[PDB]
Amino acid sequence: LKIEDFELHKMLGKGSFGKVFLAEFKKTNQFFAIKALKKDVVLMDDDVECTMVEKRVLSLAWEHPFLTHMFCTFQTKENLFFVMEYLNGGDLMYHIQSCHKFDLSRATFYAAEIILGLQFLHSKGIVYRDLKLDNILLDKDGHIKIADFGMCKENMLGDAKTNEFCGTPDYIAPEILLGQKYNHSVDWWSFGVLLYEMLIGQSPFHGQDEEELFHSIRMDNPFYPRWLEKEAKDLLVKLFVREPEKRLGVRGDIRQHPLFREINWEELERKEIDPPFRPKVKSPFDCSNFDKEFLNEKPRLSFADRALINSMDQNMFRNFSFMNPG
Ligand SMILES: CN(C)C[C@@H]1CC[N+]2=C(C1)/C(=C1/C(=O)NC(=O)/C1=C1\C=[N+](C)c3ccccc31)c1ccccc12
Numbered sequence: 001l002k003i004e005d006f007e008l009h010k011m012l013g014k015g016s017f018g019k020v021f022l023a024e025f026k027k028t029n030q031f032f033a034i035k036a037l038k039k040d041v042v043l044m045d046d047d048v049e050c051t052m053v054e055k056r057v058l059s060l061a062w063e064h065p066f067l068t069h070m071f072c073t074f075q076t077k078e079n080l081f082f083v084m085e086y087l088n089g090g091d092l093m094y095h096i097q098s099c100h101k102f103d104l105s106r107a108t109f110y111a112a113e114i115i116l117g118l119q120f121l122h123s124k125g126i127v128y129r130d131l132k133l134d135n136i137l138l139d140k141d142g143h144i145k146i147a148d149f150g151m152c153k154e155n156m157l158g159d160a161k162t163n164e165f166c167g168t169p170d171y172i173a174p175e176i177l178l179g180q181k182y183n184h185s186v187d188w189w190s191f192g193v194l195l196y197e198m199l200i201g202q203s204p205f206h207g208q209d210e211e212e213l214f215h216s217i218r219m220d221n222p223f224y225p226r227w228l229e230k231e232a233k234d235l236l237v238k239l240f241v242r243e244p245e246k247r248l249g250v251r252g253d254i255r256q257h258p259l260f261r262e263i264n265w266e267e268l269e270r271k272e273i274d275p276p277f278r279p280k281v282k283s284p285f286d287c288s289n290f291d292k293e294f295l296n297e298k299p300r301l302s303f304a305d306r307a308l309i310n311s312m313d314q315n316m317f318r319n320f321s322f323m324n325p326g
Helices: 039-045 048-063 092-099 103-121 185-200 210-221 229-237 263-271 308-311
Strands: 007-014 020-023 031-038 072-075 079-084 136-138 144-146
Touching: 031 039, 039 079, 039 308, 048 072, 072 092, 072 308, 079 229, 092 136, 092 185, 092 229, 103 144, 103 185, 103 229, 185 229
Parallel strands: none
Antiparallel strands: 007 020, 020 031, 031 079, 072 079, 136 144
C-alpha cells in the first residue's frame, strides 16, 4: 500500500527488530503495529535474507491463534514495512517484574499455549530460536502471542539440521554452545528456561559474564525449590536433558506430561479456555503494560544513505510484498 495511509502516533520500541510504531489507518481508525526497516541499514548489517525469512514466516502466522498476525507487507525505495496486529497488553517479562513469578496454574496455561505455538511452527519446518519471556505478548483476553520471527530457520523438515550460533544468552541451548548441528530441540531447551523463569522468577543458569554463563548452561544442575510442584520439576528435569535427541519435545509427547493433565488441547487451541489473567487496557493509547523507553521519541522514519540506496541492486527485496486474505 502506502505508509501515508497511516498516522504514526508513537514509537513503541527500537532495537534488533528495527523500529515498531503505533499506527492508525487514517481512514478507518484501526490501530496496527508497524515494523519499519531501512533497506541500506539492512544491507550494511548483511541481513537481507533475515528480512525475507521473517516475511515468509509472518506470511504463515495468520493460520495460528498464538502467533502475532501480519496483515500486509510493502516496500518503498528506502523502506520495508510490515503491518502487524497491535498488542498493548504487555509482554510476559514486563508482567513478571510486577509479581516476581507466576502462580502454577497461570504458568501452566502459558506453557501450554506456547507448546501449541511452537509445535505449529515446527510442523511448517520452522525453528524459532529466539524463545524468551520478552517475545511473548498478551492479547486483550490474556491468550499468548509469540512475536519476533527475525531469528527463524526455514527448511527444517525431518532430518534437516543447521549450524548458526543464534540466541539470547540465558536461553541458548547447550548443543548450540558446543557448535553442533541442531534442529527444533533448541526451542525445547529455551522452553524449559522460560518455564523455569515463570515458575521460579530467576534464570536457571548463572554467571558473572557471558563465558561463565555458557559454562553454567553446559554443566550446572538447575535449582528446584522445596515448594515446587513435583510435576513441574519433573517436566523441567525432562527438558533440561543436554542430549537433544533425549529431550521432551523432541522425543515422547509433551502434551501427555502430567503437568498438563487437566488441559484439553483441542479447546485450548480454539481459545475456549479462560485465561488466568487479562491485561487492563483503557484504549490503544494506554501504555501501562509495556516499557515506556521510546514513547516520547518523534515517530519518525530516519534518513537513509541516499548514495547506497541509489546504487544498490533494487531486486534484493522482490517477492517481499504480501496481503493477508481480506
Ligand atoms: C520489546 N518487547 C518486550 C516486545 C516485542 C519485541 C519484538 N516484536 C514485538 C513485541 C512486536 C509486536 C507485534 O507483533 N505487535 C505488537 O504490538 C508488537 C509490539 C508491542 N509493543 C509494546 C512493542 C514494543 C516494541 C517493539 C514491538 C512491540 C514485533 C513486530 C515485528 C517484529 C518484532 C516485534
